[PDB]
């Protein structure tokens, strides 16, 4: 269980890229407080399609353990920094054209019952290339990252600071063309499993 | 020449691609006010090495137009939103390992003599990978947009409130490791041929 009582940020990569074990993940852009970074590479083609297709397979969500996952948790464990025994799983969310994810927040309300566990950073990869629309936007810092496939937007959330934690409301905006694709890493701030 | 007499952007792209006449330039990211937008796909990576090597066998700066550089002032131009005419032409830096650009605004003091015609946007597109470092950074707005091939930064400070033109201020952090080469379009206010 994390503890932040002596502001750090969990994600600590400097430099441009975060060498993985599986892959070389590119740094593009850094809002800094809140920590907000806009990551490239996180994922191949292959294996953004193979999460959508595993989607729909269970449609017909967060996804269920096999191979790809595992690997995919593990490489994502090293970009946000917390093993991977925090992350709720691949959670994937497809949006058509007219729907949209309003301005929220990721950590749960504090007497919410799930605040026992409380989030602590997100980690957001985009699966497919939108037409258009489709951005995480955050509206109190006036900042949106644009989906693009295989790039992913990280932020956190486990400042001391209640107001840089509200920084970070953000949402989906609405697609206007086309379909929009998302996998999202939820991390606890103790072990989830 | 532009005016901006009746707060709105010269860059004025919509959606997650831009469509020029060559190239579909991507939108990775939006900070809104003041505009900065990261931008992939901006040049290929043969046009990045050609860039470098053109302004090495100058050098045994801005660039001769040839028809290379033409055929990128015209692509930017579509970027930027102001006709080619306006830009300076593409001014070609090297920053090897220890050396940096500090903080400083683009736009020409307002008693100076090249304020005449002032800049009003600017371009900085990476040419190469940098091992380490070399991230261009706004220190009032704690972000930094970190260098990848072939991707751009965007930012334009046109604004009538000069608070806003005041938060472009920027720099090249320090290379620690390896070499960065950009390529920078500057635009004026008014033609500059
Ligand atoms: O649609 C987006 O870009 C944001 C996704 C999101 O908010 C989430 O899945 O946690
Ligand atoms: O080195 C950077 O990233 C910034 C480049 C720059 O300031 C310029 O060329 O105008
Ligand atoms: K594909
Ligand atoms: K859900
Ligand atoms: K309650
Ligand atoms: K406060
Ligand atoms: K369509
Ligand atoms: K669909
Ligand atoms: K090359
Ligand atoms: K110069
Ligand atoms: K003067
Ligand atoms: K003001
Ligand atoms: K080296
Ligand atoms: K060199």
Request: with cysteine; charged share 25%; proline share 3%.
């Amino acid at each position: 269980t994390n503890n932040n009582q002596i502001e750090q940020t969990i994600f600590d990569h400097k430099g441009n890229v975060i060498k993985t074990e599986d892959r070389e993940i590119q740094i593009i852009s850094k809002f800094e407080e809140p920590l907000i970074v806009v990551l490239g590479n996180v994922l191949s083609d292959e294996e953004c399609d193979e999460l959508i297709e595993l989607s729909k397979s269970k449609l017909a969500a967060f996804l269920d353990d096999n191979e790809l996952t595992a690997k995919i948790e593990k490489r994502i464990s090293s970009i946000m920094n917390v093993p991977a025994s925090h992350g709720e799983g691949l959670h994937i969310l497809n949006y058509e054209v007219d729907q949209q994810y309003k301005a929220h927040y990721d950590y749960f309300a504090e007497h919410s019952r799930s605040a026992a566990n409380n989030r602590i950073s997100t980690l957001v990869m985009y699966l497919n290339d939108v037409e258009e629309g489709g951005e995480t936007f955050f509206p109190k810092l006036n900042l949106s990252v644009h989906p693009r496939k295989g790039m992913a937007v990280y932020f956190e959330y486990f400042y001391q600071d209640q107001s840089l934690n509200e920084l970070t409301l953000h949402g989906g905006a609405p697609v206007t063309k086309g379909e929009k694709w998302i996998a999202t890493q939820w991390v606890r701030r103790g072990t989830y499993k």
